[PDB]
């Protein structure tokens, strides 16, 4: 046997959960001496095990080949190799437990000093190594690590020396464990969480298990704090000063009056558990979880989960998320009405849990297990059902549960994600139910729900969710399993996939969640885009995605699918989500005399809020103030009268003049997660402006050799299009039916005979390449010598027989211009046997000047499409042109402002004003073809023109990249249509 | 009505066949004064009719805007606009008769002088204008032209002036006629054929209709020459000196003994038809065409059509083909055994016909009509069935027939191509049968064959062709039409689509053509690639195809689909086609005592040929000479004994020594189309070399720290691959299963549930991204202390569970190296529910040095794949590395030499020699990934290495880009396999 590296590879191919580590336990704050070994280490990278040197480097001998590297790190974020993104597909041949030859091996070394406080006993702790570590101290092998996002501790007693010590860690990127770590995220090897030396004094405390329940009938807490050392229960004293408690560890007591913990009111009691040689500090939240009457209840009440799936990602550091970024992102979540987090799909940094306890989130704490890449082979060889993997998978669940079991915020344990079904998942569930019956078990992969306590799905349609909400879904074949599942509450562990422009359809889910007790709510996929900061050859920073790092196989921009970008800047979807899930409902009366207020919270009343009103008109705010609202109980409602000055204004306003009344609930005082005045909920009542009044057509058409003039409009006799309006140059005017496909439009809409993505349907139909033929131009008699001008055109595409006849009728009184557009289908819009849907029915004006500022009356400030824009409120808005865009990583259709009634574009020294019945407004400095072709933001370039889109109709954006497409009510099928606009130019 | 250009556009949208032209007539060589107006004209281009100036330019006033342009020309070939390629799809919206707004309008002007010989009567002739011309002379509008490849003449009597004249022609690229001119070719506007002034003397001859039949029973000619002036029969004298004839025009006579015309023996008789004021010169070929007993017969005998489809294209001049290029390409066709031409899909230059008469080709002369782009809408609005188009389509057929009716080479009239079915095609057929019953009518678009005389198909499979050949195809529903069609002879007007590497499957068609009298033969699609010469930014010339000229819609490289490149350089397909269709069959006896000879000609005996033999061995020619063969009658065979010295050599050769006997039929004397010694047919008998003798394994394996040595081979202990063989550096050795997709592999194979192109099947299966895992390396006991080395590997792809186990066993005696490769499937090669076919089972050696010369024993000199290579004969070959490649316009798999038994690569100062049972040999200076990624030849770059492919199995190439894919016998399904090679390095 002559090949090199055989012993290293046999270890990497092991089915065992590693070796040599101390038993799994909780992460505990203790007074035992602690030394962090994080800092600058030495690092050497080899391309695989067979060439990784065996040169005594573990002693500090072979310094050459090594260079400085920060630890913790994801090493490809620091110039060593490259990140690689795959969604489902494995990046290596699927033949478990074997590893590919190209397998980056990273050797890490650090020298540190240990004082006498670390003797006689100490351990070394590793909070995360992706994916396989072998650890040596002073040349002695301590053992190995498996379970990339799980903690391992090694006893160093008798190996650690007083004074200098040399720690060496060989990390393999790929191992047998990679087959059970196939999450949809970047593959990033490294020692990516804390490395800590901890003294283990005699008569200490190794593990603690807090049991802190709440009896909602009596208001009592139920407390038992177990404590152990070396696997044996120990005498220890538990002190909870705020509750006047001093009790023995291991005894259950009833605490007469506790304030219970919830995400809404995250009450924590400081406690200490003390033995002779060590004391542990705890924060105890009293809460009990129950499943009863097909409802998920906390402290005796059904709750509504307004959730996100949170991965750990940083655009420059990879899987290392600095604490300040964590704290800020959790506050950002609370600022957007989120109350729940799923740790997709592995345990988070150990210090995350205390922050969730403190700020208040219901947490689904998920084990590091995902075998999704076996699905393509019908789950053949799936680790979850293979006996050889049982110990490894039970170990993952054990380490997951033991680490985080003391945290009130953890309300459910999840077995993993997309791991199929099998005997080892059942073993993990059995182990967990025996160890910790206080928390229900979650796992979506087995729809029969045989081994879980809630029924979980991902991306079930709104329609199917309504059936489940009513308890009327189709039955499982096994009547006993059906009876069990039908009596379970239902959660969407992933829904409304938030990739690109979207997600559409959030309101339809939310109405169901709020109506049906069996529906627990849902967790958006996902909180963040995993963009990675890169730069062009000219130094322009932007986010990269799959394939931008030379990957042979990858899934492109499916890793940029979040509510916020990788720097935690909100996408429009987050602003809409905040509104959709707002925990108070404010319904303002049409007559402005008051509002109905529903408190949708589960535990808190409305006393935390200040209720403010404001009336705005074109000239600015006409009135505003606060109203005193007697606190409304959870799940109750009331009617609140507004001050008489508000209704007096409504009465006084001349009909047709626009005005907006907004009632908002803001924090009355600072909280831990936002300042006083932070807006939580709002409602409005709008007095809409009258429809536009087209001008009397009293100006005649003047005929020149090559142009026509009609008041302030000049037209080409060769094209029929305006070439200037009030001196604003017009390069082109034409009909639009298409937009640059969103990420959702690039997804297949399964079901029905046509499974092409909408983008492909449009391409095949030629909708991305429309052309216009001029049929004729004629003047018609107007008023008092004036005339109208009708330009007749037909729009179609090369090689197609279908078209739309489009007639433009122009009129003017010399100041205002009227434009009537009439669209009539000429032939059936069917291509390849299927109907061709449209993106819009609108006009594109290409103006020969740049726009500095865009103002409008409608909704805003951010974009809105028919099935989004919940967060866009009625009002007057004004933005610099650059701020109208949306910085999606892959540029795509975005930035439309639906529901507009008037718009004004400042183009140098002139203002172009447009009025209509509701229209969508978009303004860009580059064309739709530039937007479509661009794969990253630096591909966009301004060309000196203004591209102005006025849409009479728009389709929705849906979630077709993963889950439901556009719901029927928001689809735009071909139709005939007519609409009027008025235009004016002010100088 | 205020738009510009309305009158011009109404004319362009006219359904009429133009206006003002003289009646259609023959192209006739006459003694009337003729002046060619070809030369340097003045030219101005506008983007459409609405902006095309009406500035009096027709008089020579508006010189500015005009620049010099050669006429004839295709104007986009001279920097004015750009060529655009579409196959089927129209490049404009389909709404006949309307034209798009973007419609290049080219104004052409020339001043010329006319002497007194052009008075009182003269005409102007235009032999082609694409697509719509309006003609003025001295400011007077003569009329308009429709039918782009048809001739028009205009009377200029009373308009032409003695002295200076100004001719003006406005040409529109697009018109209503574009809807009936949708051939698969470049769209190229221009005045692209001759412009001629012709005097029309009094008492002259306007038209002549030659009728020249042949009675094969008596050997007599049947002659009648009709002559007319102004539509009336005239007295004229017909003189045929070689036949001693002086007769009146309009009288039918029997000529006692004529030598008949055929493509094989194109006998022409010079004749003159003379009236008082004009004489016409003719070449008369006597031949009669008959359909009888379901056979197409000429001069009483069934013929076999060995044909090509000939478009008119030049890579720098467009639709203008210089006469010297025409003459050379026709000789090239004859040099490759072609005897028939289809003028796809329009009449050729008028002077082509005399060349076909003279050189000898059976011509299918096809009308300028193709409406293929209406098929996508179910033929809705198809001009062929629309009454408004009747006059226009009958006019096209009339002009087609009248121009060329006097030519013996025209044996069938074709109505057009891919024009669907309809009443106007029936009208065209009726008109033609009435006007010229001497020629059968062809049209493939109506499979019922109701209005034609032969049954024509395009790309019918070999299987379906065999059924038709036997008269057993499924019946038409109408019993009367079925009886008619079943009694028709059958032609493939297009078959064996010759795009890229291919066409495969030619032999299977040819065997049927030769076996079944009803099968007339076939015309390859197509003679030439329509490449257009372009240059890179660095000045590297190459051919461009669709999309290389900025087209919005195009069909890519489907215009480069020929047997020769646009400069008439043969592709390998032409060399194979020549052999497939060779008109003599030479079957050499295994014992080298003689050969059987079949004369497959229809009229000629074998007296034109010299029969030569040659015996070659490794050292060179051992013997050769000529053998006297008594002339063999058409369709007969004989046995010919070879000189005894040949068999004496065979007897004397030691068994296992290779030797090749080749018998060839060459021209004994110069012909009009090739020189004496030109090879027409050949056959061989091969004494094959013995199988390779692997060495005695008497050298042991020497183990070093990181390498192993086994005689002259060094191996890496990290990869198991050789790193040098005899000092030749080896960068990589591995198994191959894939090749860079050919044009055929990018085509869909219709039928069955899987219609992905093979290239897509491979991509989805990961066959283009295989990786290898090392399982182990071990030494085994050899002989007398020696050892063998077995390297065990597994080949698979990321995210797939299927693989192949590949074991390499190495042995050496210190000079020769033995390599045994064993391949075993591990799991089923099924992906997306369908079996994954392989391109090959072979080895790729990547050598770290450049190869200067490649030599081999096998077949050659050109490439061969399992279903091609008919033209590659057995022998010894040697080529510089560059000449091993094939210069396809889109680079793709090519250059394999199948059937090799030994190869030698000269790499600097060393020669690497390889021996095996039959293997395919390929050698390249760039990798397969470079070949696949390259879209044009300058994308290929040498990297300083040698890529050597040794294939134990290869799949065929088929014709799946259009028509049959690889036939079952040539497909390569996954299998287990083993094979032996020997290697030696000589310094
Ligand atoms: O777990 C390791 C990480 O822990 C975070 O809390 C810290 O802010 C980061 O800098 C890094 O050290
Ligand atoms: O003010 C900036 C941000 O800071 C928070 O503290 C505040 O409460 C939020 O509403 C947000 O506006
Ligand atoms: O009359 C203006 C027209 O210009 C053409 O160049 C274009 O193809 C048409 O779609 C239309 O825009
Ligand atoms: O028909 C026009 C063409 O005719 C060819 O015979 C000639 O060689 C070309 O130069 C061009 O004049
Ligand atoms: O010799 C060059 C070429 O020229 C032809 O005249 C000859 O007959 C052909 O066989 C070809 O070889
Ligand atoms: O042992 C050599 C190997 O090297 C790796 O880098 C490659 O992925 C494998 O396919 C194989 O070539
Ligand atoms: Na884009
Ligand atoms: Na290629």
Author numbering:
A (entry chain A), B (entry chain A): 24 to 1010
Paper text:
The role of residue E441 was previously proven: a loss-of-function mutant E441Q was designed, a biochemical activity assay was performed, and the protein was crystallized. The introduction of point mutation E441Q did not disrupt the structure of protein, yet no catalytic activity was exhibited anymore. Determining the crystal structure of ArthβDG_E441Q/gal complex at atomic resolution, 1.5 Å, resulted in discovering six galactose binding sites at the surface of the protein. Five of these (G2–G6) have a potential to bind larger galactosides, e.g., lactose. The analysis of atomic resolution ArthβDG_E441Q/gal complex revealed that galactose binding site G1 is a possible allosteric site of enzyme. The G1 site is located in the cleft formed at the junction of tree domains: Domain 2, 3, and 4. It is highly selective toward galactose molecules as residues N360, I361, and K357, constituting its bottom, shape it in such a way that binding of galactosyl moiety is highly preferred. The correct conformation of hydroxyl groups O2, O3, O4, and O6 is necessary for monosaccharide molecule to enter and bind within G1 site. Its limited size prevents basically any molecule larger than galactose from entering. Single-point mutations of residues E441 and E517 introduced in the enzyme’s active site were not sufficient to change spatial arrangement of galactosyl moiety bound in the deep binding mode but were enough to abolish the enzyme’s activity.
Psychrophilic β-d-galactosidase from Arthrobacter sp. 32cB is an interesting candidate for industrial use, as it can hydrolyze lactose at rate comparable to mesophilic βDG from Kluyveromyces lactis. Furthermore, it exhibits additional transglycosylation activity, it catalyzes synthesis of GOS and HOS, for example: lactulose and alkyl glycosides. The functional dimer of ArthβDG has two independent active sites. Each of them is located on the top of TIM-barrel Domain 3 and is constituted of residues from both subunits of the dimer.
